[PDB]
Amino acid sequence: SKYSQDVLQLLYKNKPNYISGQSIAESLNISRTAVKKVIDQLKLEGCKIDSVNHKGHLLQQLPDIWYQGIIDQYTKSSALFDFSEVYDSIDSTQLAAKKSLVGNQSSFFILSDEQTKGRGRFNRHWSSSKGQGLWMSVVLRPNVAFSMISKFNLFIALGIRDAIQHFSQDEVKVKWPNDIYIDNGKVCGFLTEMVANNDGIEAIICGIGINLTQQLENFDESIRHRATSIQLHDKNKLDRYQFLERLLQEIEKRYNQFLTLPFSEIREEYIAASNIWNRTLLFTENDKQFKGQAIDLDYDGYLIVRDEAGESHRLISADIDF
Amino acid sequence: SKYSQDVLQLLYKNKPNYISGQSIAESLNISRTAVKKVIDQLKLEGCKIDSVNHKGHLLQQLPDIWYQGIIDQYTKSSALFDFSEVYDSIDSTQLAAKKSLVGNQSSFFILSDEQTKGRGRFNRHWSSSKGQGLWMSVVLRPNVAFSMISKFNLFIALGIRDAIQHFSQDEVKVKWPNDIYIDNGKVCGFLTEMVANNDGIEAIICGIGINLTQQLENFDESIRHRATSIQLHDKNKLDRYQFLERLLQEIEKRYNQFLTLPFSEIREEYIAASNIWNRTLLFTENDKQFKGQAIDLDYDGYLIVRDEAGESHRLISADIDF
Numbered sequence: 258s259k260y261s262q263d264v265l266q267l268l269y270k271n272k273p274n275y276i277s278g279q280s281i282a283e284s285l286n287i288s289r290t291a292v293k294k295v296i297d298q299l300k301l302e303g304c305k306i307d308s309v310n311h312k313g314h315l316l317q318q319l320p321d322i323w324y325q326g327i328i329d330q331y332t333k334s335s336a337l338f339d340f341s342e343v344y345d346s347i348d349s350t351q352l353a354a355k356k357s358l359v360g361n362q363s364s365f366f367i368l369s370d371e372q373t374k375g376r377g378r379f380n381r382h383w384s385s386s387k388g389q390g391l392w393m394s395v396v397l398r399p400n401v402a403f404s405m406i407s408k409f410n411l412f413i414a415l416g417i418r419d420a421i422q423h424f425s426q427d428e429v430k431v432k433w434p435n436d437i438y439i440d441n442g443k444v445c446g447f448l449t450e451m452v453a454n455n456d457g458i459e460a461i462i463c464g465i466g467i468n469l470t471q472q473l474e475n476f477d478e479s480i481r482h483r484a485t486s487i488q489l490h491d492k493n494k495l496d497r498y499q500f501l502e503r504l505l506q507e508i509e510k511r512y513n514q515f516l517t518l519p520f521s522e523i524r525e526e527y528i529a530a531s532n533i534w535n536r537t538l539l540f541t542e543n544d545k546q547f548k549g550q551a552i553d554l555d556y557d558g559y560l561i562v563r564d565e566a567g568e569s570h571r572l573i574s575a576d577i578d579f
Numbered sequence: 580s581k582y583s584q585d586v587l588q589l590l591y592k593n594k595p596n597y598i599s600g601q602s603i604a605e606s607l608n609i610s611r612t613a614v615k616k617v618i619d620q621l622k623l624e625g626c627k628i629d630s631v632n633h634k635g636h637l638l639q640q641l642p643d644i645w646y647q648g649i650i651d652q653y654t655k656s657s658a659l660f661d662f663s664e665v666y667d668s669i670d671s672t673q674l675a676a677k678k679s680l681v682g683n684q685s686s687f688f689i690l691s692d693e694q695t696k697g698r699g700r701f702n703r704h705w706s707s708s709k710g711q712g713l714w715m716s717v718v719l720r721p722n723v724a725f726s727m728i729s730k731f732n733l734f735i736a737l738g739i740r741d742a743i744q745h746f747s748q749d750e751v752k753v754k755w756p757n758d759i760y761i762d763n764g765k766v767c768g769f770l771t772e773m774v775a776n777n778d779g780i781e782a783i784i785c786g787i788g789i790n791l792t793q794q795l796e797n798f799d800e801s802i803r804h805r806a807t808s809i810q811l812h813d814k815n816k817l818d819r820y821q822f823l824e825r826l827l828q829e830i831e832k833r834y835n836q837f838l839t840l841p842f843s844e845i846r847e848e849y850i851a852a853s854n855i856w857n858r859t860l861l862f863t864e865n866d867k868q869f870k871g872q873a874i875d876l877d878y879d880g881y882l883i884v885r886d887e888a889g890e891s892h893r894l895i896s897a898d899i900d901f
């Protein structure tokens with residue numbers, strides 16, 4: 258109902274204590290019996306709320322659905338982010354962010370449980386299953402020249418990798434410049450875009466898709482052999498909210514480093530986290546394709562590639578298959 | 580009415596011949612007497628339409644108002660532009676374009692007779708009086724790296740300058756990298772922004788404001804001594820549509836050169852059109868300000884400045900006062 262979110266928010270705010278129907282009823286100035294029905298509704302949706310006579314209700318576990326009410330709590334207590342928008346289903350969080358950023362200087366993120374028209378790089382299809390991953394776009398407002406986009410994209414990589422890492426028992430790796438892998442599985446794709454002019458960046462929009470809970474069974478058959486979810490490498494249930502909390506924390510951390518450090522400072526780390534070394538890489542550039550090795554990431558984020566013909570290239574970007 | 584535009588369009592399409600009320604009435608399948616009223620309306624709005632018994636109506640001269648109906652004709656017959664949007668008044672054509680470009684690959688422009696929140700560079704106020712200038716934003720779709728924005732901005736300068744030139748008896752000059760002057764008067768401001776990522780440009784949005792018909796009397800008093808309209812340097816009435824036609828033609832011309840030439844090819848021309856030479860220039864950069872001379876524009880669009888302290892700078896952009 259009109260108050261589902263408000264109740265949820267109250268439940269979350271009051272953890273680890275119980276609050277009474279009465280008490281919520283007074284908060285929202287609605288009837289006790291309306292609260293009982295809104296709670297029955299949340300339980301039905303898959304909220305695990307323990308209800309005890311006299312004591313009240315304790316939110317124990319949220320389902321794999323994003324609730325604005327709860328996310329409102331993450332923006333309230335955050336320094337970086339002014340607000341968020343949360344959807345059950347949308348064409349793409351990236352389109353939404355590009356639209357919402359116009360005309361303001363807010364920093365915000367957009368979450369949606371599903372995307373019907375999720376796109377990655379080169380307008381390639383990104384699979385966004387209802388309930389199974391974090392499909393998000395982050396808009397930030399770094400006061401910097403437009404050529405700093407590349408640098409943004411390297412720092413953020415490590416933010417995302419650290420967040421996924423905390424939750425997988427297996428080894429998590431960055432595939433420069435835009436993917437996160439767990440062994441052979443792509444567990445995350447991200448894409449950093451900007452609105453900018455000669456004088457600087459108007460906004461960074463970083464779209465980030467991370468598979469949380471798919472079983473291989475759930476991945477379209479063409480991608481199954483190279484995809485993975487965070488769940489498939491975690492012994493415990495993966496809690497999307499718990500993960501979202503770590504992710505925002507690392508995004509913020511790397512954003513501050515982005516703002517205050519040159520790339521050289523994280524280069525080694527980025528290196529030791531990358532999974533593109535000692536192996537043949539396939540490169541696409543328009544029509545052409547060629548094989549190559551990654552020799553090094555220079556102090557400026559460019560990949561140094563020695564191609565199959567023996568020639569060296571220094572690239573700011575590429576699409577690499579393995 | 581519902582059909583104002585349709586009638587206007589028909590009037591325009593049929594020039595230099597007359598068409599009858601009857602004939603329009605059949606085109607739109609509406610009544611003759613409705614046509615007579617829609618025509619009376621257009622006349623009232625300031626359309627100069629000659630009406631002769633038996634013969635019909637001839638559109639002779641449009642007022643200083645943009646009509647979608649007529650602009651629809653400019654996009655129909657154009658190779659570059661998929662559509663346009665036309666408004667009487669809007670916050671900013673630039674905000675509108677940034678919003679309309681999301682989710683498609685259309686090329687289009689937006690015209691509005693007035694802007695209530697017109698912005699230039701650094702979010703500085705741009706004065707957009709109803710009826711007095713061309714306030715436009717152009718969205719194009721060049722398939723190129725994001726660093727090519729600067730180059731875009733130089734080519735387009737010359738497009739705009741050539742279009743204004745054709746109409747002023749006086750000498751029209753580019754003030755690198757974003758202004759067009761007639762002697763001491765800023766006659767146009769433009770601003771080239773982009774949506775882009777590491778892989779390239781998603782869209783160029785070029786906002787372009789050109790003063791057409793202000794008398795000095797009409798300019799807010801702070802800018803009066805350094806502003807000007809195209810009218811104030813044209814012996815003939817300045818026809819906004821006639822000008823819009825030249826402007827689109829030159830935008831297209833320079834866009835094709837942008838796509839196919841390096842900067843070196845237009846450099847000399849850009850040079851001989853620039854008005855920043857042999858004079859002291861004031862530069863702002865964040866907090867700092869300093870004086871300097873423009874020595875040269877290198878083959879890559881960067882300004883070579885020797886500052887007042889004798890030091891050389893190579894800049895991709897700057898804000899210069901005189």
Ligand SMILES: CC1(C)O[C@@H]2[C@H](O1)[C@@H](Cn1cc(CCCCC[C@@H]3SC[C@@H]4NC(=O)N[C@@H]43)nn1)O[C@H]2n1cnc2c(N)ncnc21
Nearest residue numbers: 349351375376377378381383384393446447464465466484
């Ligand atoms: C043949 C292969 C290897 O299989 C596909 C495809 O090639 C490749 C195409 N591509 C371009 C990019 C760049 C990163 C995109 C970020 C998406 C986020 S979601 C929130 C935000 N909203 C939005 O619209 N976009 C962002 N990544 N992938 O990915 C694989 N692929 C597609 N879906 C998935 C998936 N769910 N999991 C793993 N791999 C996938």
Ligand SMILES: CC1(C)O[C@@H]2[C@H](O1)[C@@H](Cn1cc(CCCCC[C@@H]3SC[C@@H]4NC(=O)N[C@@H]43)nn1)O[C@H]2n1cnc2c(N)ncnc21
Nearest residue numbers: 671673697698699700703705706715768769786787788806
């Ligand atoms: C003190 C001084 C010198 O007086 C002001 C101010 O400093 C300076 C501030 N600025 C930043 C930029 C960059 C170019 C802007 C392009 C506008 C187009 S309109 C269609 C599109 N929609 C949109 O929102 N923007 C674009 N130019 N000027 O301009 C002067 N100024 C303001 N208005 C005018 C004017 N009408 N005519 C001449 N000078 C003006």
